[PDB]
Design a protein that fits this description.
This is part of a larger assembly, with seven protein chains of seven kinds. Chain A is mostly helical. Chain A has helices spanning 2-20, 24-49, 52-79. The longest helix of chain A has 28 residues, at 52-79. By secondary structure, chain G is an all-alpha fold. Chain G has one domain. Classes of the chains: A mainly alpha, B mainly alpha, C mainly alpha, D mainly alpha, E mainly alpha, F alpha/beta, G mainly alpha. Bound molecules: iron/sulfur cluster. Chain A: It comes from Thermus thermophilus (strain ATCC 27634 / DSM 579 / HB8).
Amino acid sequence: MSYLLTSALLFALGVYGVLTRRTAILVFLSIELMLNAANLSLVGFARAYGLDGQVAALMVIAVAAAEVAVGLGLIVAIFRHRESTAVDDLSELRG
Amino acid sequence: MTLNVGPQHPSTHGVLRLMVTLSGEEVLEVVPHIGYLHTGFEKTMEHRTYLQNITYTPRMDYLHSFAHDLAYALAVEKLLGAVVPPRAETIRVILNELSRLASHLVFLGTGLLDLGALTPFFYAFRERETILDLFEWVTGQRFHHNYIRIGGVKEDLPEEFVPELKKLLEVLPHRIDEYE
Amino acid sequence: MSLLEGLALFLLLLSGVLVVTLRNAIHAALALILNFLVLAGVYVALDARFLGFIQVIVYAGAIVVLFLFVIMLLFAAQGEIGFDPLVRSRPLAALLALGVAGILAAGLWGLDLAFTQDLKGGLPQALGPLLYGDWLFVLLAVGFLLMAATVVAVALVEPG
Amino acid sequence: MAPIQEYVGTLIYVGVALFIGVAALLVGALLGPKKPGRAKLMPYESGNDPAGEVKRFPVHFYVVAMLFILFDVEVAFLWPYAVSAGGLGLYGFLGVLAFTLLLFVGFLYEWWKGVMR
Amino acid sequence: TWSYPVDPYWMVALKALLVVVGLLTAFAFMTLIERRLLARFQVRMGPNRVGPFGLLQPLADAIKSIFKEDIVVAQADRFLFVLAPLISVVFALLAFGLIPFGPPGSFFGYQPWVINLDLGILYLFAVSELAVYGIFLSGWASGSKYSLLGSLRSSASLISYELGLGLALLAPVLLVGSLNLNDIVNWQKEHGWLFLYAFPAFLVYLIASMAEAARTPFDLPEAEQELVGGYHTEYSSIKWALFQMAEYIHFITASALIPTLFLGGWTMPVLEVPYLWMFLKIAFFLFFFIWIRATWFRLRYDQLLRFGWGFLFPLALLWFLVTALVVALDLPRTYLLYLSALSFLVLLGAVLY
Amino acid sequence: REGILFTTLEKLVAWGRSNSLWPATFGLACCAIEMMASTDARNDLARFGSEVFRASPRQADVMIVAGRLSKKMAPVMRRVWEQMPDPKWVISMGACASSGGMFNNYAIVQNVDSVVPVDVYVPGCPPRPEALIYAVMQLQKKVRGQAYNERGERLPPVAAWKRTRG
Amino acid sequence: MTLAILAVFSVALTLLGFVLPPQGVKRATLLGLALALASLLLTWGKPFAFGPYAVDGVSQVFTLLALLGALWTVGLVRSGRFEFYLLVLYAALGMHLLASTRHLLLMLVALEALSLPLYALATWRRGQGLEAALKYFLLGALAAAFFLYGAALFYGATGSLVLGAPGEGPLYALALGLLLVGLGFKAALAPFHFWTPDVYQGSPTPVVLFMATSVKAAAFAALLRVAAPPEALALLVALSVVVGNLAALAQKEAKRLLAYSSIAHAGYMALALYTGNAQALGFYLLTYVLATGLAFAVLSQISPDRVPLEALRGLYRKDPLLGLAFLVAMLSLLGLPPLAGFWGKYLAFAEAARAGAWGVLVLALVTSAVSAYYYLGLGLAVFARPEETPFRPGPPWARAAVVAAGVLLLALGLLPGLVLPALAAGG
Ligand code: SF4
């Protein structure tokens, strides 16, 4: 029960992350902490309703990992040529 | 990435410096820069007599010391136009080729170690010690031996240098083969 | 419980604060490794052992290396590069963070139920029959995702 | 379940190891005189750095890493089958093979295209 | 352990402490012996003075190593510089206490393991990934970009082989049906030493635990004679000893796992007696690697990459499918014997003519 | 803490260091090739911890300056010395290094003592391998504190506080 | 199966693509989709499970659409790597899968399967198109965390991980709210809309086609299985329909204008969700897909890059048929009767009024009159003085498509009672 509250806190923290950072890769890093917040929650309930929440969690891991790989990959290919990773120095598309 | 493969280190050879123009995976250029042992023979020898010069010729190369000595000797002998008795030229080829073997042995010894792993060094060296010991007998010393004195060598071959030479001539064929 | 419990959850949260506050990518990422250990421990404690070990192996052993390689690859000496009109927005950001916990907190005092089932310790024996049982479809979905990821990833990076 | 007895015990092992580690490091750290220099301080031989602080490195390292993550997820899943494998029958084997061929298809693509750039 | 005894926590600590200091002193006198067994191979005598037979030469070495100036260079990450050796040694140390050496009830009222889990192999696998943390951090830590580039070379390589280890342990795991070291040992007692039913898994494992810094990659690198190996090269006093150390404790750990898994723990059809037969199996593989170490060259990191990544893993999963099929249709174990026997024959005629 | 105190302890530490001397070679010319000789095979050397092939200054500590040493090379060698941890000794092998040998010129740097303090000299061009063994025995017994010379004076074991590094 | 064709072709083609020339892979992939389409028609109305995969009334209709969009976009582009088809293929599968499930984990896995290749497809390496890509990925990845967090609290409130099981007090209320967020973002219901203006501008035109048809279809498909609270819906719609239509007046770059439009249409469609329907959205999206598909084909025929508003003008001179097509399209999205766009609106509105939510429905309608500013802003601009700008006319290939779409469009305008009968929700 403690754990399920804790999970929401780690989610909250990640959000504070996602909004503050000025380096793009660390944004993405923050996202990962939120994702593990999720898996904790899911797992906590897995103790309540017995054993499917495990298999659930594993599937989440794989998806998360997939989105890491592609995402950092993208970050790499965009800013290998750019010499600063400043996120708010990308601004021409705007209303 | 122009990389500075520095004086000797960290690839532990000579004292050459090489500026490696590198893309990252693809070697593009090496700019070699030399000048780390310019101790000027070309100058120094202008201030020492001809007998003395025979002692500055094996101090340049050293893996093959005697070849400089031999090369220099000839150049003078030729110049003032006086023969070399026949036995002299015989001794001189026996030593010259003996020093050549000495050089190749050190070359293959270092190379193999250089990239590659440890062992083949020691065998290539082992044989090299024997050659140096043979040399030791006849000229009184190891590499950097001075034995030419214009017109021939400066002492006879000792009694003992021929027996010991025979020993080493038996072994070498089998021995070379193990490097192959 | 709450003697030991406190320790683990304090550590976890504290570590959490660090990874979103600190300066410099390496110290940051590294904190997240301490995080995933704690979390792994907490898994083990909650009768999910298998999942625990996978937490270490994948998420903390595979993933973060990839992170580290990116932040080494392209350097990162500031977690706060440039200065730009975003400065006041630090307090509204910190506000909203509280909010998103607040509403979720509210919800969780809204269904409170028993924690009381068995799980077999979560050992991969007892997960097996389910996984390739009726979850076999979900699995093959996973498998497709990975393949797509590889191919996508290549197409972004190498020209080709 | 499985006994908790040894997991606590694991932590014990770690606690021992870390202690002996750190102890050694403090022994090492305190003894041996001090005297800074002008080129001990400024890094290695030829240039400021002996890579002279070049910018950016091949994407190779990214590729190798990326490969490793996805495929480590592969390994993760094949363990549940690996332990209890006789329980699942022929239908089991067909499932596993199916999954594997998908990830191997990945493999052959990124292989023919290049681990090298 | 659902059927085996457990230890008293104080006694865990004692056995643990013993296994640490045991592995230090182990490493010490082994290094001396490694020098010397090389020496003889390269027609020489190693340490021979520092009497009574060399036996104090390691003492001298250790004492030398400390009492030297440790200095952190300008341009280095303060925190990491200190941490980085610790990390590398911790993750080497762990998982020697996992593997049993004797049978139960024979450590004088106690058990011959530190832990024994209920998920053995995963823990093992896990520690092998975490050493590589130590490595690349050191790279950055040193703050010379030369070291960094080296350390990435290293890490990249290590991690490539890391994947093969996963598929390597699957072959005996099927057969034993549990994944705890003890069960693997007892399994072998009856049915046969596991290198028999899974010759290709012996192979792929052997050379894959080999590939951890242990020469024959070696554009690992070690600094000398190349675009340098990182990590070290900017570390001086105590810290340096630790890296070097770690690499050897790993070496010996690997020399133990290959017996534990594949040729029986201490099971024999000649005599089981607790410690001894294990120490001898260790002894063999230890000695085997040093002969390898001497007599062949080094690989490029190009080649090394082709080899594990491109070659080994297709053999590793290929073997997995075969063995999974065989077990799935629930067939006789004779059918693995024939194939094993055939693979050994394939690889024999191909090398030896 | 700094350094060492107590009669007992120092005698211990002094044995430990002294019998373990670890060479970082600084090959430079013909002198070098004979120094390699001293390792292999028939000749001894591997009996004082020098067996392993060490060749970063960081990982070792007695610098064997073996060969002629050009004007251009002085700052390089200088810097190499500076980058050694604190108890660091220089055997100076060979005449070109020791005094300048037979080269007395604009080019060559005469008497190695310019670029560092020497400790033990071993004369010859080259001195044959066995002489180098003798040199390291000298340096061994020097560091033990039994460093007296004809003038009755002892040299302090480490001389490298004799000169400065900066 | 349908799944069978996609999966098989995709995997096989993966390795295959090395041998074949890039035109040949365009040929291959076209065939593949079309076969997938074939298999769809001939198995219509037989609901078939085989796992969590479950083909039903919803699935059939929306994956018809998803496949449609995918056929078109693959048509137009000439590549330099076989991969810029391969990734699209994948993406189509991902959207197929998204519709044909009801189990939350499949839904997650599907969400990455459809979203991932989209990020990469945002790159023809045009500098804008990297800025675009990034925004989308980070915002997407944020939503990934949200939708995943949503699922985790859902499992808490109910034993099922499938959608369906009673529903509870607060927690169930909570969980359902965070799920609408994820899904919301993919369909661009405000106030998650933020990426839709930048990405539509930044990405290369044919790609944008694909997003503006397929992702909207797919997104709605899965959305429909969510039993969304009537309050949530009301919020979303208001924000979508107001911000969408008003802001769109300010814009003057063609694609970005259409982006804002594509917020508004999502807003109207989300009305249908009240009582839930699959006939209403079936029809609606049919008219929307055709119209946008037509329209963006035309924009491509203008130029590959950012199309200034003026560039449209003179389209009738350049070719008559094509010029008229685009007109019909623009009127259709405004919904001027008797065009099919009107019926699409009407059916959706009818479900709102049954549900009794009055206010929303009024607001929607008022601002739907606003929409006529910019729609005519395009549609009439067509006829004026011809511009001197880049253009090309394309093959008979494209002519047939565009003009097919425009006839097909107004055909359903007069006879909606053809399709509507058999867009059954049960078979
Ligand atoms: S002293 Fe002699 S052996 Fe040495 S570098 Fe000089 S010439 Fe060579």
